[PDB]
From a paper:
Among the two PSs, PSI drives electron transfer derived from water oxidation by PSII to ferredoxin, leading to the generation of reducing power needed for reducing CO2 into sugars. Diatoms are a main group of the red lineage and play important roles in oxygen production, CO2 fixation, and biogeochemical cycle of carbon and silica, which account for about 20% of the global primary productivity. Both PSI and PSII of diatoms bind FCPs as their light-harvesting antennas, conferring a brown color to the algae different from the green color seen in the green lineage organisms. On the other hand, diatom PSI binds more than 20 FCPI antenna subunits, making it the largest antenna system found in the eukaryotic photosynthetic organisms and supporting the efficient survival of diatoms in the aquatic environment. Here we solved the structure of PSI-FCPI supercomplex from a diatom Chaetoceros gracilis at 2.38 Å resolution by cryo-EM, which showed many unique features of the diatom PSI core and the binding of 24 FCPI subunits surrounding the core, providing a solid structural basis for revealing the energy harvesting, transfer, and dissipation mechanisms in the diatom PSI-FCPI supercomplex.
Structure of the PSI-FCPI supercomplex was solved by cryo-EM at an overall resolution of 2.38 Å and a local resolution of 2.2 Å for the PSI core based on the “gold standard” of Fourier shell correlation (FSC) = 0.14335. The overall structure of the C. gracilis PSI-FCPI is an asymmetric heart-shaped monomer when viewed from the stromal side, in which the PSI core is composed of 12 subunits, including PsaA/B/C/D/E/F/I/J/L/M subunits and 2 previously unidentified subunits PsaR and PsaS. However, the diatom PSI lacks PsaG/H/K/N/O/X subunits, among which PsaX is present only in cyanobacterial PSI, whereas PsaG/H/N are found only in green algae and higher plants. Two previously unidentified subunits designated PsaR and PsaS were found in the diatom PSI core. PsaR (chain h in the PDB file) is a transmembrane subunit with two transmembrane helices and binds one Chl a and one Fx. The innermost layer of FCPI forms a closed ring consisting of 11 FCPI subunits (FCPI-1 to FCPI-11), the middle layer is a semi-cycled ring consisting of 10 FCPI subunits (FCPI-12 to FCPI-21), and an additional, outermost layer consists of 3 FCPI subunits (FCPI-22 to FCPI-24) and is located at the PsaA side with the largest distance of around 150 Å to the reaction center.
Numbering used by the authors:
A (entry chain d): 79 to 210
B (entry chain i): 2 to 34
C (entry chain a): 16 to 757
D (entry chain e): 2 to 64
E (entry chain f): 77 to 238
F (entry chain c): 2 to 81
G (entry chain j): 1 to 41
H (entry chain l): 29 to 172
The structure:
């Protein structure tokens, strides 16, 4: 279910079949023209749409344009060369901008920023001042 | 001797760098080392 | 009827209220200043009318009235010049002997020892030598008196006030609607037939009745005084038939279709006037007549209110091939709903035109007594090369402003615009190669010559004595133009220019024109020209094609036209915006045009310009050093830049000592630019914080907080000083060099 | 501590307004908030922000 | 004298400069008729030039072997007119501007919109302030030994370091 | 990969999460501020390092912070 | 005309009037008392 | 009519099928060049390639040489073609010494593959024979 497009030279490279490639799925109620992140234009097909891209940003940039410009909503996948797929956006079905009970704290310092140690204190260690 | 500069300068100027650029290339592109 | 007049009455009240509130035009600046960045934003956004309102009608009204303001400043400029020519010039003394009297229309006041700038020019007159060619242009019009220049100056002031009034009238009192502006087919018919067609007709009318017979008497040797008033040429046919004996027929051979009776004033002789060294006025009168018929006929190609004619829309939409897909569909909405797309064409055309104009005025000099004034020839040529250079890149800037703001994908499915964006990696990578191919070859020819010569091996250099690179294609074309009079142009008496070969024209012992032979030193330089244009196009083209997105930034269009970067991740994002592409390409245009004017200044001085004596012994200015001194960089550095610098550096104590000061002043400004271009903002803002502290310590600080110049702005400052200092240093070097050899 | 409307001096060192004065607007009575005090300023910082949250031990009272 | 310099009225090379500067303008004067505007302008220029050499001769300046005037800034009181007296003059005008400009910022500070009065000057107020800096050495001295010239150390924001 | 740390001065106004162009940050439950939510950096390996999150943070000094780290193909931002 | 007066009080207009009056101040003094290297006059 | 479509009916792949990329001329021409011909030992692939390159690399050395105007203009330049081929071969040795990996299992059912360490070595030695031999062949063809 790929959208209507005449092709372009700004698509995927070897990295796709050798390193991870990304696909994005969305559902549209009607046929409308949208801008390609690597290409100028394309007509989306009513029903489910499937697009393959080369970067997570390119996929997420299309989502942003699909969101506040068309009122529609999508899923990102990471595809490996062997065939294993990963589910990325949204992580738990709920968007990262909205709090969801069940999420946890990652990478949080429990103090303000002026409270980091001097670099001379962590001398000859394999760390850094912001990892204490 | 008085015949030495016509022996060393091609060796130092053309030969030594071609071996040294070849050696570093193999070292820089070698995965487990 | 589809073409009508729609005007809104009393649209904007005229009060001094907004004058007292700077930044009223935008939503963010109207709150007032908090930091000093606000002062800078005030100026950068003042003419950005598109970002002030959302209505296309209100943007169009602002543009229209601003055009009246731009023209009113041009009329004031023209009215000044004529005023200076009438009260602070030596025009009369020049008219009596235009071979010995130098030209001047500016006089300086004596206040700090600066009177030395009033040169001893001639005709009991002291002033600054001006090189704009006002004098030569006045002679060709048949001026001959200061009284006549005074009327042009009063008429220029009246026209200037009429423009000021029209711009105020069309923005406040009679503001025309959006429907009026969107009439392309009407507008084209009026500019072709009315502005260009009737402009050439009336001008031709002035040339036949006023400019032609006065010039004939000036050329024969009659003093200005004995020449009658211009209006007396309009009344007595007796005076007109003595000079051109076909006025005895009157206007009857025009309506009988016997136009060959007028071969007295509608010539096709070619060449130049042996007396003045300019083009034959009789050829120029024929030139404007043939133009004006062409322009008036061309202003009937579009359909307005009567069925007949072409609609611009059905033309473009018919052009589609099996490689182009939809072809030209959509280019109407584009070019009738966006002012940026219009300037992008227009500035590219007007800039190309000014380059074209400069190439045709040195080869076929149209004014009398201008071809031997080498200071005017050199000044006028470079000027149009610079104005052409800036306007060309300015077209590419608006092409990229269009892609960011006015471009929409839904309006362009599968058309030529959509398709260029689709293989944009292919246009850029192929151009990229052509650039690496042209630079290694054209510039490597000079390196080879630099090293071969230094190693004591001139037998192996690319030269006219070693391995020749003869420009055989351009030499072939020269022969065609030389043999053209009689054969290909059977009614032409002489060649269009004497550059393609022919005879040597001389006025006052100085050479006006000569054949310009092309050898291998020519050939090598033409590729440098090729090469620097291809690189400039590589930066500007890339800026337009990647204005909306790239593999690097997929949402570049949301960031805008001019943003500094997208941060220090993804490697380096500096100068990714399409504004920064315009910024880089400005340095190339500079590089390209500098080599053009260097090539022109040296080739003319080596192989054309000079004096003569008995038996045609030509002595050139630099003595023919062009074939064996410009093939190496050392030759360009030692014979062009070092040798010809002697005037500007030894100008002290003389009347051209202002050129020596501006020479140093522009070397200073150019170096001053490098402080802005090499550094960046966060070193300067920390520097300001220690300074602010010394103020806070003394109980005082400005409430408008001092902030370093922004990233984008610090680049635009460094570029404006780079151009000012660079172009200026050359400006001072060119005039003090050419005033001494003229 | 301060009240609403009190004029304080910022004692945070990495704040833009260290050793500078300004006016308390709201004090969160709930002590679970770590920085309960909204303090407003008349001069902006480098990000053009006019206010910030602080703790009670980071502000001094002027009189 | 100082540095082996000679006074300009007794320098043989300063006198030669005077002659050659006049000779250059006289040889330019000969190409014009006597009543015309270029002859009256160059005649006025040679008067200005001749008065420039006379002025220096009695000035009391020092010349070198180059024939040009030199200036002495050791602090000698005999060459005061060269640096001291125009120095005291500049200090009076430069300290007048800085004092008056500072009075303005301090005045419009206690206000709703101080920034509004820096882009759009309150001219009646500014005009008043500009002429109050005629006695600045007394006004800058009253505030130094008051406490209103320099602020305290706990009023200046400082970089994290110190 | 890059390192993104989140300090306690976070007032939980979700503006960093809305600015991230590669979905690195998210909002989680927290009981230390009015909004009872703190930013978190669970996927720092998609972090390209463009610092858009810090341009969006209203606190002084910033609550979110990006530190340069070893570069992979993902943080280099390569499409090849 | 209290709005034209506020327009004449804006910083760039006041700067050009102040400078025009001050450049012409220096030009006039250099017209009557020229060539003053030092006080000697 | 349309003469431009996505390569292999994959619109999102970053390639375009044009008459320069995939037309009948460019298909049959590229399929018969020695770097892509079916039925060639990697020695033979390198031989041919070398046979066609060493022959024209001769030209610019013999004509625009430092000793082009001497009685030993042909010798001067032929020697310098051999020196050019020695540099190119040296780039072929080092490239294959690093791009390909040695094989553990003696298992080898495709001895014909070019993109391997063993075959690249054969491909490299065939280039050197064919390029020195074609350098010598027009040494004979120009000595006339
Ligand atoms: C010729 C080129 C040039 C010039 C003129 C300067 C000038 C300056 N740089 Mg520099 N800079 C340059 C190249 C140059 N830069 C380059 C290539 C780099 C590498 C990127 C830098 C990097 C750099 C840095 C990092 C620093 C400087 C600093 C300075 C300042 C030194 C203080 C000073 O000299 O005050 C004199 C001011 C001038 C010479 C500017 C010209 C002013 C003119 C108009 C005065 C005219 C004379 C007289 C006063 C006329 C009276 C005025 C009239 C109204 C009465 C000054 C603004 C430092 C600074 O800003 O500290 C204060 C600083 O930290 N620059
Ligand atoms: C025959 C009719 C005619 C003529 C001569 C012009 C001429 C012009 N138009 Mg224009 N225009 C026309 C019809 C015409 N228009 C119509 C019908 C429309 C509506 C579709 C427009 C819409 C239009 C727009 C939207 C704009 C112009 C602009 C311009 C100016 C282009 C700048 C230039 O080359 O300056 C050359 C300047 C001169 C030659 C000086 C001439 C000055 C005045 C106007 C004299 C002309 C009046 C009259 C014909 C003279 C009679 C001569 C007398 C001896 C008999 C130019 C003055 C642009 C501009 O600058 O606007 C101000 C612009 O933005 N036009
Ligand atoms: C566009 C500008 C223009 C203007 C204003 C004039 C104006 C004039 N021309 Mg004319 N003329 C022009 C262009 C112009 N011409 C051109 C372009 C040519 C060459 C193709 C001529 C060739 C020409 C000749 C040969 C003669 C005139 C004459 C005249 C005068 C009387 C014409 C008359 O009353 O006929 C009546 C008006 C109409 C029928 C309308 C008049 C001053 C005559 C003249 O000089 O008389 C003294 C005359 O003999 N003209
Ligand atoms: C007909 C010509 C034309 C027109 C109408 C415009 C119009 C516009 N351009 Mg544009 N442009 C042009 C030619 C033109 N340009 C050319 C030739 C170039 C290439 C140099 C550009 C490059 C360009 C860029 C790169 C940008 C624009 C922008 C803009 C827009 C806002 C401009 C503004 O507010 O500036 C206000 C005007 C000024 C601040 C004046 C400053 C001018 C310089 C610094 C001073 C010149 C020095 C002086 C001549 C000599 C000094 C001597 C010294 C001794 C004093 C506006 C739509 C900007 C935009 O946002 O687009 C929407 C933008 O980013 N243009
Ligand atoms: C003298 C200074 C200088 C030089 C040499 C270059 C060189 C180049 N710039 Mg430029 N550039 C400069 C200043 C300079 N720049 C400045 C000041 C700026 C700031 C505005 C820029 C901004 C800039 C941009 C924005 C762009 C360039 C581009 C280019 C490239 C043009 C392609 C080409 O022909 O390369 C060929 C190399 C040369 C012409 C120089 C050397 C020629 C040699 C001698 C011949 C061949 C040698 C051989 C290959 C090696 C043998 C020698 C070795 C064994 C020792 C080239 C690498 C463009 C580019 O990359 O497009 C392709 C481009 O887009 N530059
Ligand atoms: C790129 C610019 C350039 C060019 C064209 C030349 C040209 C030349 N140099 Mg050189 N030279 C250059 C830059 C350049 N130089 C620079 C920058 C330096 C300074 C370091 C020197 C220093 C230098 C020295 C010291 C000497 C030369 C010499 C020579 C000559 C012979 C070189 C030779 O045999 O090479 C070998 C040439 C080749 C292998 C040619 C390969 C190119 C082929 C023809 C490309 C074919 C493309 C093809 C059309 C693609 C389509 C294929 C399709 C149809 C299938 C020749 C005239 C020598 C001499 O005596 O001069 C007379 C010499 O001693 N050069
Ligand atoms: C510093 C070291 C160095 C030395 C010793 C040389 C030596 C030489 N160069 Mg060279 N060169 C160098 C650096 C050096 N180069 C660099 C850095 C550059 C780039 C800027 C160049 C660019 C250059 C050019 C462009 C040219 C030379 C040429 C020459 C030859 C001199 C002209 C002559 O009479 O030969 C005439 C040559 C002969 C009579 C036959 C010589 C044949 C050689 C010796 C065969 C070597 C075979 C062997 C397999 C090489 C293996 C190389 C590698 C494995 C180490 C000579 C062999 C010229 C040349 O090659 O002449 C053809 C020439 O055109 N040089
Ligand atoms: C130059 C070649 C040329 O003029 O061909 C002309 C060729 C004609 O295409 P079409 O017949 O599809 O064009 C029909 C309409 O677009 C004409 O307006 O244009 C191209 O195919 C573009 C190819 C880019 C050329 C690559 C460089
Ligand atoms: C330099 C200058 C100036 C001046 C100018 C002038 C002086 C102008 C003039 C102009 C003119 C003076 C024009 C005229 C015009 C005319 C015309 C253009 C006519 C035409 C006509 C016709 C076209 C006719 C037709 C017909 C016929 C033929 C037949 C039938 C009938 C009829 C009628 C239809 C000014 C001041 C502005 C400013 C500054 C500069
Ligand atoms: C220009 C052109 C073209 C192209 C062409 C070409 C590119 C060609 C090439 C050609 C070539 C490039 C050739 C080659 C040849 C080679 C040869 C002919 C070789 C031979 C060799 C031999 C025979 C052998 C040797 C040997 C050996 C190996 C061993 C030892 C012994 C000997 C010595 C015997 C075309 C068609 C597209 C089109 C038109 C234009
Ligand atoms: C010097 C410099 C500054 C400092 C420059 C500043 C802060 C602008 C100062 C402009 C003044 C305030 C305008 C008035 C000009 C002078 C007061 C008068 C000079 C003119 C003479 C002819 C008298 C930057 O802010 C900057 C930012 C980004 C990249 C590079 C740089 C950079 O190089
Ligand atoms: S550095 Fe950039 S990509 Fe990474 S979390 Fe911040 S905004 Fe997102
Ligand atoms: S880090 Fe900044 S943007 Fe993110 S939640 Fe906290 S205050 Fe909001």
């Amino acid at each position: 279910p790929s959208p209507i497009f005449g092709g372009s030279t700004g698509g995927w490279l070897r990295k796709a079949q050798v390193e991870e490639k990304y696909v994005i799925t969305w559902d549209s109620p009607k046929e409308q023209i949208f801008e390609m992140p690597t290409g100028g234009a394309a007509i989306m097909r009513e029903g489910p749409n499937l697009l393959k891209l080369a970067r997570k940003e390119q996929c997420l940039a299309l989502g942003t344009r699909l969101r506040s410009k068309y009122k529609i909503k999508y899923q990102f996948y990471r595809v490996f060369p062997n065939g294993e797929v990963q589910y990325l956006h949204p992580k738990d079905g709920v968007y990262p901008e909205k709090v969801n009970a069940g999420r946890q704290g990652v990478g949080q310092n429990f103090r303000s920023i002026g409270k980091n140690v001097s670099p001379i204190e962590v001398k000859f260690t394999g760390k850094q001042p912001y990892d204490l | 001797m008085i015949n030495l500069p016509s022996l060393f300068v091609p060796l130092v100027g053309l030969l030594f760098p071609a071996v040294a650029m070849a050696s570093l290339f193999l070292h820089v592109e070698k995965r487990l080392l | 009827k589809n073409v009508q007049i729609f005007v809104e009455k009393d649209a904007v009240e005229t009060s001094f209220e907004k004058w007292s509130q700077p930044g009223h035009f935008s939503r963010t600046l109207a709150k007032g200043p908090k930091t000093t960045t606000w002062i800078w934003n005030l100026h950068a956004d003042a003419h950005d009318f598109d970002s002030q309102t959302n209505s296309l009608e209100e943007v169009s009204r602002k543009i229209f009235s601003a055009h009246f303001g731009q023209l009113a400043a041009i009329f004031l400029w023209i009215s000044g010049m004529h005023f200076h020519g009438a009260y602070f010039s030596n025009y009369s003394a020049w008219l009596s002997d235009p071979i010995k009297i130098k030209q001047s229309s500016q006089v300086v006041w004596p206040i700090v020892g600066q009177e030395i700038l009033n040169a001893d020019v001639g005709g009991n007159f002291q002033g600054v030598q001006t090189t704009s060619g006002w004098f030569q242009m006045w002679r060709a019009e048949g001026i001959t008196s200061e009284v006549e220049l005074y009327w042009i100056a009063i008429g220029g002031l009246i026209m200037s006030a009429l423009m000021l009034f029209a711009g105020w009238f069309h923005y406040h009192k009679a503001a025309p609607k959006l429907e009026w502006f969107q009439n392309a087919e009407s507008m084209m018919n009026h500019h072709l037939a009315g502005l260009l067609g009737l402009g050439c007709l009336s001008w031709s009318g002035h040339q036949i009745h006023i400019a032609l017979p006065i010039n004939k008497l000036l050329d024969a040797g009659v003093s200005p005084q004995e020449i009658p008033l211009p209006h007396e040429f309009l009344i007595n046919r007796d005076l007109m038939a003595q000079l051109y004996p076909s006025f005895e027929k009157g206007l009857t051979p025009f309506f009988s279709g016997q136009w060959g009776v007028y071969s007295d004033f509608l010539t096709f002789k070619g060449g130049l006037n042996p007396v003045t060294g300019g083009l034959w006025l009789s050829d120029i009168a024929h030139h404007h007549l043939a133009l004006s018929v062409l322009f008036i006929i061309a202003g009937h190609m579009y359909r307005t209110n009567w069925g007949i004619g072409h609609s611009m829309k059905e033309i473009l939409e018919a052009h589609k091939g099996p490689f182009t897909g939809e072809g030209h569909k959509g280019l109407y909405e584009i070019l009738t709903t966006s002012w940026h797309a219009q300037l992008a064409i227009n500035l590219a055309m007007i800039g190309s035109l000014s380059i074209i104009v400069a190439h045709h005025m040195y080869a076929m000099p149209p004014y009398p007594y201008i071809a031997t004034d080498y200071a005017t020839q050199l000044s006028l040529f470079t000027h149009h090369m610079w104005i052409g250079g800036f306007c060309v890149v300015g077209g590419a800037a608006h092409g990229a402003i269009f892609m960011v703001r006015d471009y929409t994908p839904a309006n362009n499915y599968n058309n030529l615009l959509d398709r260029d964006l689709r293989h944009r990696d292919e246009i850029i990578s192929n151009l990229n190669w052509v650039c690496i191919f042209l630079g290694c070859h054209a510039f490597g020819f000079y390196i080879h010559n630099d090293t071969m010569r230094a190693l004591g091996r001139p037998q192996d250099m690319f030269s006219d004595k070693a391995i020749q690179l003869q420009p055989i294609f351009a030499q072939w074309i020269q022969n065609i133009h030389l043999l053209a009079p009689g054969t290909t142009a059977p009614n032409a008496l002489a060649t269009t220019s004497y550059a393609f070969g022919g005879d040597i024209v001389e006025v006052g012992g100085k050479i006006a024109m000569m054949p310009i032979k092309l050898g291998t030193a020519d050939f090598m330089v033409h590729h440098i020209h090729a090469f620097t244009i291809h690189v400039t196009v590589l930066i500007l083209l890339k800026g337009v094609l990647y204005a909306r997105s790239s593999k690097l930034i997929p949402d570049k269009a949301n960031l805008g036209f001019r943003f500094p970067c997208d941060g220090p991740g993804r490697g380096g994002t500096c100068q990714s915006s399409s504004w920064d592409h315009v910024f880089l390409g400005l340095f190339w245009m500079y590089n390209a045009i500098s080599v053009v004017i260097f090539h022109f200044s040296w080739k003319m001085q080596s192989d054309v310009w000079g004096t003569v004596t008995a038996d045609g012994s030509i002595s050139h200015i630099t003595g023919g050093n062009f074939a064996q001194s410009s093939i190496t960089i050392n030759g360009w550095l030692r014979d062009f830049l070092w040798s010809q610098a002697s005037q500007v550096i030894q100008s002290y104590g003389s009347a051209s000592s202002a050129y020596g000061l501006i020479f140093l002043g522009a070397h200073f400004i150019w170096a001053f630019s490098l402080m802005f271009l090499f550094s960046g903002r966060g070193y300067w803002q920390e520097l300001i914080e220690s300074i602010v502290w010394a103020h806070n310590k003394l109980n005082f600080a400005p409430a408008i907080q001092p902030r370093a110049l922004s990233i984008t702005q610090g680049r635009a400052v460094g570029l404006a000083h780079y151009l000012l200092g660079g172009i200026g240093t050359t400006w001072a070097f060119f005039l003090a060099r050419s005033l001494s050899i003229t | 501590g301060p009240k609403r409307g009190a004029k304080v001096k910022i004692l945070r060192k990495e704040s833009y307004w260290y050793k500078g004065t300004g006016s308390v607007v709201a004090v969160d009575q709930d002590p679970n908030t770590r920085y309960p005090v909204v303090v407003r300023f008349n001069k902006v910082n480098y990000a053009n922000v006019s206010t910030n949250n602080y703790a009670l031990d980071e502000i001094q009272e002027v009189e | 004298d100082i540095s082996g310099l000679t006074p300009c009225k007794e320098s043989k090379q300063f006198a030669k400069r005077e002659k050659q500067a006049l000779k250059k303008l006289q040889a330019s004067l000969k190409l014009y008729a006597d009543d015309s505007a270029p002859a009256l302008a160059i005649k006025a220029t040679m008067e200005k030039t001749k008065k420039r050499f006379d002025n220096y001769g009695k000035y009391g300046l020092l010349c070198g072997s180059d024939g040009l005037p030199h200036l002495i800034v050791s602090g000698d009181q005999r060459h005061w007119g060269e640096f001291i007296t125009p120095g005291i003059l500049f200090l009076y005008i430069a300290g007048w501007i800085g004092w008056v400009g500072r009075s303005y910022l301090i005045a419009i500070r206690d206000e709703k919109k101080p920034t509004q009065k820096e882009i759009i000057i309150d001219v009646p107020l500014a005009s008043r302030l500009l002429f109050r800096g005629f006695s600045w050495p007394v006004a800058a001295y009253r505030e130094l030994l008051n406490g209103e010239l320099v602020d305290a150390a706990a009023a200046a924001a400082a970089a994290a370091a110190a | 990969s890059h390192s993104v740390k989140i300090y306690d001065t976070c007032i939980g106004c979700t503006q960093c999460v809305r600015a991230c162009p590669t979905d690195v940050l998210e909002m989680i439950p927290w009981g230390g501020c009015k909004a009872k939510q703190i930013a978190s950096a669970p996927r720092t390996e998609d972090c390209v390092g463009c610092k858009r999150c810090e341009s969006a943070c209203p606190t002084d000094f910033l609550s979110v912070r990006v530190y340069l780290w070893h570069e992979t193909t993902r943080s280099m931002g390569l499409a090849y | 005309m209290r709005d034209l007066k506020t327009y004449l009080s804006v910083a760039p207009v006041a700067s050009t009037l102040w400078f025009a009056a001050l450049a012409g101040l220096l030009i006039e003094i250099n017209r009557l008392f020229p060539d003053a290297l030092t006080f000697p006059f | 009519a349309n003469f431009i479509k996505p390569y292999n009916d994959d619109p999102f792949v970053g390639h375009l099928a044009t008459p320069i990329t995939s037309s009948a001329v460019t298909r049959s021409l590229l399929k018969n060049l020695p770097a892509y011909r079916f039925g060639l030992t990697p020695l033979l692939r390198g031989l041919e390639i070398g046979l066609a390159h060493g022959y024209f690399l001769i030209g610019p050395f013999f004509k625009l040489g430092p000793l082009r105007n001497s009685e030993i203009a042909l010798f001067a330049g032929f020697l310098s073609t051999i020196g050019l081929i020695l540099i190119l071969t040296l780039g072929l040795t080092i490239y294959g010494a690093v791009v390909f990996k040695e094989e553990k299992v003696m298992s080898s059912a495709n001895v014909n593959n070019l993109q391997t360490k063993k075959a690249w070595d054969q491909f490299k030695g065939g280039f050197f024979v064919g390029a020195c031999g074609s350098a010598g062949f027009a040494l004979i063809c120009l000595y006339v």
